[PDB]
Amino acid sequence: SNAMVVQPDRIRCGAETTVYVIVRCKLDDRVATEAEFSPEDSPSVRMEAKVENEYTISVKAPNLSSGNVSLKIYSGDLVVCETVISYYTDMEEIGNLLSNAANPVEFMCQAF
Amino acid sequence: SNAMVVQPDRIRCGAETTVYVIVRCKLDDRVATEAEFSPEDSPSVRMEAKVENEYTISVKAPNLSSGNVSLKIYSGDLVVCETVISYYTDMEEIGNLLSNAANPVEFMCQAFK
């Protein structure tokens, strides 16, 4: 799409995180740039976004609950990025890290 | 410096990860760009680095051991970025996340619920 990368696409709940969106089309530095975070079962949230450069937008992600959140970025009534970013809690990530670090396929003495 | 942001600056050991560097000065598109990862007790690893745009470089980070790694970005004999990135393991991050809880009763209630 037009959004090359949304770094990071995963956000930890409660942690102040800055999301960076690199764009392929040079952004118009004359229009207004804002972001919209839409959770699953919650009203949308309108965050002001900073234009770091002709291809880079930054936004301080809001403290939302766990689950998936849709991220839109309007560069002046024009959607320059439409993607989904996921929120997660500390316990969720600890459980995923244990499920990853406790895998007998990671041992594999011969791996065959 | 010339590196506005280097994201991510932390890399999980097993997970293949792409690092993005935003530069303050225009990049020459027609010049070969590479990266140099210097670990603490290991020889440096050189990687092909893609110039994504006039201000953005991307590089696939190599699978290194945990600790701090120095990242140098060369735009053809020209150092455009010099920063440090940290490698971490699964258990290290588990400990870091546990260190963020309020009190042990919280973690116990969340574990036994």
Author numbering:
A (entry chain B): 1 to 112
B (entry chain A): 1 to 113
What does the original paper state about this entry?
Subsequently, the shorter TIG2α construct was crystallized, and the structure was solved at 3.1 Å using data from a native crystal and phases from a selenomethionine derivative. Data collection, phasing, and refinement statistics are summarized in Supplemental Table I. The DBB domain structure reveals a typical TIG fold followed by two α helices. The TIG domain is composed of seven β-strands (βA–βG) that make up a C-type Ig fold with a broken βA strand. The DBB TIG fold exhibits structural similarity to TIG domains from several TFs despite low sequence similarity. It shares an identical domain topology with the NFAT, NF-κB, CAMTA, and Ebf1 TIG domains, with root-mean-square deviation (RMSD) values as low as 1.6 Å (21–24). The TIG dimerization interface in TF is composed of symmetrical interactions of the ABED β-sheet. The conformation of these TF dimers shares a high level of similarity to one of the crystal contacts in the TIG2α structure with RMSD values as low as 2.3 Å. This finding strongly indicates that the crystal contacts in the BCAP TIG2α crystal represent the physiological dimerization interface, even though TIG2α is monomeric in solution. The TIG2α dimer also shares the helical features of the Ebf1 structure. By contrast, a DBB construct lacking the last C-terminal α helix (TIG2α, residues 179–288) was monomeric in solution.
The B cell adaptor protein (BCAP) is a multimodular regulator of inflammatory signaling in diverse immune system cells. BCAP couples TLR signaling to phosphoinositide metabolism and inhibits MyD88-directed signal transduction. BCAP is recruited to the TLR signalosome forming multitypic interactions with the MAL and MyD88 signaling adaptors. Using a combination of biophysical and structural techniques, we show that dimerization of BCAP TIR by the DBB domain drives negative regulation of TLR signaling.
